[model samples]
Target: PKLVLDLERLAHVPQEKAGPLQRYAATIQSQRGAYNGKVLSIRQDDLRTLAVIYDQSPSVLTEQLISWGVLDADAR
Candidate 1:
């Protein structure tokens, strides 16, 4: 599945936000697959979904979910 970036949400992020979220979406795009090469091929929608999962207040183990294929990962 393709990851659809929420441009509106991205546009509204407060400048003071910390961690990886503070960066521009384009910047994130540039570093998409640092942890695993497969992440590079993941669509923007998938990346957005993963970002949402990562942003949850309690946090979530998106990496494990990716490994299990509950969420899609790039086959590359």
Candidate 2:
């Protein structure tokens, strides 16, 4: 599939954690019901290998969540 970016000038990007990591957190949290919508939190899991490849540690991962302004952080 071909992908196209919305490269429109002044395009808006959500501050939320919508990346793969955060999205994963979002899915799990949603399952719990009544989760904090402001922050994304995830627990460590299978993706640990991938996370390591990306140079994302549990601590630094929160660095991203911090920027996302979420009340939660993912452990994955």
Candidate 3:
């Protein structure tokens, strides 16, 4: 089943409680990468945008996304 999270609910969560929420959001957003090699060509700007949107450290998220197969290692 798909989970839908509202921005308001996410905004109200305490930072600690929001950790998983952030991760989930990032994952969902990164799901676009599932089609990376098939349809989309992962780009550095796209990764940067996801990093900013998920409030994750750029380097951390970049590495994580790459490791998760959500981004190509040579995307940038």
The prediction achieving the highest TM-score against the true structure is: 3
Cα lDDT of model 3 overall?
Answer: 0.51
Q: Is candidate 1 or candidate 2 better by TM-score?
A: 2
Q: Candidate 1 lDDT, tens digit per residue, 10-71? A: 34544443224425344566676343223333354554455564664212434433344433
lDDT tens digits, residue span 19-66, model 3: 654565556558864412222333445555766766788677755555
Error of 2 at 54 (Å): 5.6
When summed lDDT is taken over every stretch of 10 residues in candidate 3, the lowest stretch is 1-10
Error of 2 at 63 (Å): 1.4
Writing each residue's lDDT as its tens digit, candidate 2 over 1-76 gives 1111121210223534245544455556578783544433334453454356447874564454344443233221
Model 1 lDDT-worst window of ten? 33-42
**How does model 2 score by TM-score?**
0.36
Residue 34 CA displacement from its true place in model 2, Å = 6.6
The runs of at least 3 residues in candidate 3 whose Cα sits more than 4 Å from the true structure, single-residue gaps closed, are: 1-37
